[PDB]
Amino acid sequence: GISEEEAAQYDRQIRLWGLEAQKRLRASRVLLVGLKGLGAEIAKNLILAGVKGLTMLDHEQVTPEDPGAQFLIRTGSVGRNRAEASLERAQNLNPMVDVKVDTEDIEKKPESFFTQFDAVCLTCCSRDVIVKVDQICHKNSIKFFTGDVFGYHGYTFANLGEHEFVEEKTETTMVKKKVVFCPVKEALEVDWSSEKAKAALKRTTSDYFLLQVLLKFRTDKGRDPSSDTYEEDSELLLQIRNDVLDSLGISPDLLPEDFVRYCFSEMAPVCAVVGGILAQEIVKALSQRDPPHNNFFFFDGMKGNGIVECLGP
Amino acid sequence: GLPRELAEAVAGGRVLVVGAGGIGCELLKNLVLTGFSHIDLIDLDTIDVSNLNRQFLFQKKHVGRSKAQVAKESVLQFYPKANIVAYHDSIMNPDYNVEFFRQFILVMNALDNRAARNHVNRMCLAADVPLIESGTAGYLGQVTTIKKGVTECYECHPKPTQRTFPGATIRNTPSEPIHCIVWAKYLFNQLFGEEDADQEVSPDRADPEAAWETKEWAKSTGYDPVKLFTKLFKDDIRYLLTMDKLWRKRKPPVPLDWAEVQSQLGLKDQQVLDVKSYARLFSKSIETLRVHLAEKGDGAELIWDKDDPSAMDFVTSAANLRMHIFSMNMKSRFDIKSMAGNIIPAIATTNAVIAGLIVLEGLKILSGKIDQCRTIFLNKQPNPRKKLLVPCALDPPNPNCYVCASKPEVTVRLNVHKVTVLTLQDKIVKEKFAMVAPDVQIEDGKGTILISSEEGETEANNHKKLSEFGIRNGSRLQADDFLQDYTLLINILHSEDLGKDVEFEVVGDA
Ligand SMILES: Nc1ncnc2c1ncn2[C@@H]1O[C@H](COP(=O)(O)OP(=O)(O)OP(=O)(O)O)[C@@H](O)[C@H]1O
Ligand SMILES: [Mg+2]
Ligand SMILES: [Zn+2]
């Protein structure tokens, strides 16, 4: 039973996915880690959407040249904790939402920490943390999402387990459906030796392999490629490309050496796109309405391509 | 970085944003965060509570204030440097002429209606400034670039008009719920707003479908709900039964008496109340409306707004009362609101996606790579090729376009003995051809002037049939809109057998 103020406030979206779907959203609590560019957008979208509550988790502090690039953080916060520096503006987006903050490293949280959330969205995390949080969420029936932005590119991933939802495709009949997702560990470790895989490979966007390269760069270095160390990072990226693609039996040429010029930094327009798609999928999953993308979303801002790939099974 | 040559234009170039709603808000934010410092923002509306689920620069405390103003203020909070100029006004205002538009290196539309978008399209063609057109609806959205002499314009391929209805059945033979709703909205204007001959609420005794042989009264009665009720749901429905021809194949209307009516899950608005309840709503809304109208002063007129409770209550109740009279099932206030206000479902996420694509296209434009720009469609499901976002190349100007073509020319078919200069001015030149302040002259000897932009000039010719000026089959008219710097040659074709309720038609339209 939503209040009069909420009915007025969500009118335009209730006309879209219905009141029931809105109610399931009003009872959902989401955990978001990493309040940088992408994280900021997702936070805004979910809070405006009207989730039960949202917990912004980030243990990093606002470094120089960061406030004027994050609309949730005021210019006078160089040195404070990102999550806390975002709380005020984030909470004002919607008083109906219980926006909380957490400053502890995600890699030190016990499974009990995650069991208070219906969905978990990871940003700026390493491959090991992504796999770890996904596994934890799976055991507890927690919807899992991850996403990042790299230059003009971006990507989202979901693991909703055995997800059932209602899809209205005809008065309008609401049909119940069921989609099955696979573990992120399997999605990130696909064998291209199989005949079935060799056929799918030629229809797979190279962005999947660009993701592998960047993930690996984020592991060898606790950081992502930076414009300050461009010449240096480009050098490494090219070397990592050859190692990763080679260790998969795929020609390193599949990814033009030119790719290094378009996967640097966080561009506001790209955070807006990927943050809109990712938040949209989170709302869908929580409301259990409409078919969720299964299971990867790749965005290339240079070409205007937004591709959905099913990888892992 | 951006890099240099790009971050430069972005830093000094003045850019314009029309509309501060779903897309507008996200746009400002993305523009500012990408590096744009000089931004003009224009919007003619004030903030409303329903804006709050997707226009993040606005909060509950801002309700009632200017969207453009508050938007500028909110942005300055996380980027105090920003050089933003806000205008609480309509982009159609003559103050924003070609010289105004020519000041920008990029214009970006974020509007919700054809009229303003066509106008902006023409202003940009005239100032020769790149224009990024965008729209969203529920989960769908699209973005495209418009550049004079290089791509199609907004009007090179017009979109299908909305289902219109004949003032005959709306007044004498309604069959669908939407008909009653249209009737209710006409009724509103006739009573509290602007009066229009085509929106008469009374039963038209001129309908050829059945052989034959308001504002004043309402205001005199002090807007007595009971008097108004009786006349509209008893007298008129009964007076309608006079035309026996009308009914003999369908269930005829049943009159309602005020006293007789009074003697008889989900959201509250999604509930369908009974007749008595809607009669009570009718009476209630009128009481409130008449006070508002009186507080605005004499001769004042009210403008119907889907977001105003009373205005919406009036249409809801009046509509459902007519529906019942015609044996139709009534509908909830929630459904009538959607139809009456042509409300488009909207969420934050779709608007965020579009605003992000908009800035990406602009960067290419300002970077001199408009040939890499494209139309991008945002769909709800991946297409057969796995694409959720589908980019399509831009098309060259359409030589058949009646707007951006070298010498715009159209041929209109109408009855030169029945069409007045007013209909030509309002329904054809302004409404159909989206001109704001037209100057229309006949292509003859003295260059007869039919319509003037200057207020009070051709007021006298308004009720005069076109033929009275010598306009006939083969006549040519030159319509000019000096604000849009648009000139349209109109060829006239005289036709007496057009069709039922058809005043004119553009040769070629679907
Ligand atoms: N001629 C015009 N000049 C300036 N602004 C305009 C003009 N026409 C429409 N607008 C503005 O365009 C914006 C469109 O925004 P959008 O459709 O996303 O939201 P909305 O109009 O508030 O939604 P809703 O109509 O459902 O209440 C509005 O803020 C509106 O005031
Ligand atoms: Mg609107
Ligand atoms: Zn055109």
Distance (Å) from CA B44 to ligand 1 centroid? 8
What phi and psi, each to the nearest 5 degrees, are found at residue B490? -115, 115
Q: How many CB atoms lie within 10 A of CB B22?
A: 28
Please list the residues that pair with B465 across neighbouring strands: B420
Taking the Cβ of residue A9 and every Cβ of chain B, the question of whether any pair is shorter than 8 Å is answered with: yes
CA distance between the termini of chain B: 49
| Chain-centre distance for alpha carbon A133 | 13
C-alpha A89/C-alpha A66 separation (Å) is 16
In whole angstroms, how far apart are CA B165 and each of A278, B40, B114, B171? Answer: 42, 39, 19, 10
Q: Is B80 exposed, middle or buried (0-12, 13-18, 19+ CB in 10 A)?
A: exposed
Q: Measured between CB atoms, does A280 come within 8 Å of chain B?
A: yes
The residues, ordered by sequence, that sit 6+ positions from B181 with a Cβ below 8 Å of its Cβ are B315, B319, B336, B339, B340
On the 0-12 / 13-18 / 19+ scale of CB atoms within 10 A, B149 is exposed
B27 with B17: CB under 8 angstroms?
yes
Report d(CA B496, CA A30) in Å as an integer.
67
How many degrees, rounded to 5, is the angle at CA B452 between CA B448 and CA B455? Answer: 145
One DSSP character per residue, B487-510 reads: EEEEEEEE-S---TT--EEETT--
B424-446: string of b/e by CB count within 10 Å (b at 16+)? bbbbbbbebbbbbbbbbbbeeee
Decide: helix, strand or coil at residue B451.
strand
Alpha-helical segments (H) within B128-230 = 177-192, 215-220, 225-230
CA-CA distances (angstroms) from residue B256 to B102, B235, B260, B320?
59, 9, 7, 12
Task: Measure CB to CB from residue A9 to each of B1, B52, B347 and give the nearest one.
Answer: B52
The verdict on a CB contact (< 8 Å) between B1 and A265 is: yes
Q: Which atom of ligand 1 is nearest to the CA of B119?
A: 1
Measured CA to CA, the distance from residue A197 to residue B211 in angstroms comes to 75
**Count of CB pairs separated by less than 8 Å, A with B:** 166
Three-state DSSP class for residue B423: helix
Contact status, residue A152 vs residue A302, Cβ threshold 8 Å: yes
Count Cβ atoms below 10 Å from residue A131 Cβ, excluding itself. 19
Nearest to A165 by CA among A28, A283, A47: A283
Q: Which two tokens stand for residue B263?
A: 């003697």
**At a CB cut-off of 8 Å and minimum separation 6, what does A212 contact?**
A188, A244, A245, A248
What count of residues does chain A have?
Answer: 313
Detail the DSSP E strand segments found in B394-444.
409-414, 439-442
Domains by residue range for chain B, with CATH? 1-161+346-406 (3.40.50.720), 162-345 (1.10.10.520), 407-510 (3.10.290.20)
CB B470 within 8 A of CB B450: no
What is the whole-number distance in angstroms between the Cα of residue B120 and the centre of ligand 2?
A: 17
Per the DSSP assignment, residues forming a β-bridge with B477 are B442, B490
Breaks in chain A (C to N > 2.5 A) come right after 170
Contact assignment for A227 to B80 by CB distance below 8 Å? no
- Report the side by side order of strands in the sheet with B504-506: B449-451, B439-442, B476-481, B486-494, B409-414, B504-506
Contact B187, B223 (CB under 8 A): no
Contacts of A112 (CB under 8 A, 6+ apart): none
Whole-number Å distance between alpha carbons of B22 and B350: 9
Q: Do B56 and A304 touch (CB under 8 A)?
A: no
Summarize chain B as % helix, strand, coil (round to 5).
40, 15, 45
Task: Specify the CATH number of the domain A1-313.
Answer: 3.40.50.720
Residues constituting chain B: 510
Distance from residue B88's CA to the centre of ligand 2 (Å): 15
As a whole number of angstroms, the distance between CA B27 and CA B440 comes to 38
What is the DSSP secondary structure assignment for residue B135, as one 8-state letter?
E
Distance from C-alpha of A12 to C-alpha of B137, rounded to nearest angstrom: 11
Q: Which of B348, B357, B381 has its CB closest to that of A291?
A: B381
Q: What is the resolution of this structure in A?
A: 2.2
Contact assessment for residue B55 and residue B29, using Cβ atoms and an 8 Å cutoff = no
Whole-angstrom Cα distance, residue A56 to residue A84?
8
- B57, closest residue in chain A (CA to CA): A93
Q: Among B40, B44, B122, B353, name the best residue to mutate to test ligand 1's pocket (greatest count of ligand atoms within 8 A of Cβ).
A: B44
Q: Is A8 on the interface with B (CB under 8 A)?
A: yes
Residues of B within 8 A of A290 (CB-CB) are 380
Is residue B348 within 8 A of residue A49, CB to CB? The reply is: yes
Burial class (CB in 10 A: 0-12, 13-18, 19+), B407: exposed
Distance between Cα A145 and ligand 3 center (Å):
44
How many Cα neighbours within 13 Å face the side chain of B104?
30
Q: Token pair of A86, please?
A: 């975002």
Tokens representing B302 are: 């009210």
Ligand 1 pocket test target in B27, B65, B111, B133 with most atoms within 8 Å of CB: B111
Indicate the SS3 state at residue B269: helix
Identify which of B110, B354, B1 has the alpha carbon closest to the alpha carbon of residue A276: B354
Q: In chain B, what's the furthest Cα-to-Cα distance?
A: 80
Cβ within 8 Å of residue B463, ≥6 positions away: B420, B421, B422
Structure tokens at B163: 């289902």
Query: Is any atom of ligand 1 closer than 6 Å to the C-beta of B355?
Result: no
In chain A, where the domains are located: 1-313
Contacts of B382 in chain A (CB under 8 A): 293, 307-308
Contacts of B456 (CB under 8 A, 6+ apart): none
| Three-state SS sequence of chain A | CCCHHHHHHHHHHHHHHCHHHHHHHHCCEEEEECCCHHHHHHHHHHHHHCCCEEEEECCCECCCCCHHHCCCCCCCCCCCEHHHHHHHHHHHCCCCCEEEEECCCHHHCCHHHHCCCCEEEEECCCHHHHHHHHHHHHHCCCEEEEEEEEECEEEEEEECCEEEEEEECCCCCEEEEEEECCCHHHHCCCCCCCHHHHHHHCCCCCHHHHHHHHHHHHHHCCCCCCHHHHHHHHHHHHHHHHHHHHCCCCCHHHCCHHHHHCCCCECHHHHHHHHHHHHHHHHHHHHCECCCCCCEEEEECCCCEEEEECCCC
Amino acid at A183: P
Residues contacting B272, CB < 8 A, separation 6+: B329, B330, B331, B332
- Which of B308, B333, B307 has the alpha carbon at shortest distance from B318? B333
Cα separation, A241 vs B304, whole angstroms: 62
CA dist., res. B248 & res. B246, Å (int): 7
Cβ neighbours of A88 in B, within 8 Å: none
Cβ burial of B170 (10 Å; 0-12, 13-18, 19+) is buried
Side chain identity, residue B145: T
Q: How far apart are CA B232 and CA B217, in angstroms?
A: 12
Nearest-Å Rg of the Cα atoms of chain B is 26
- CA–CA distance from A220 to each of A147, A215, A225, A233 (Å)? 19, 9, 11, 12
Which among A69, A279, A304 is the nearest to B349, CB-wise?
A279
Using an 8 Å Cβ cutoff, are B70 and B47 in contact? yes
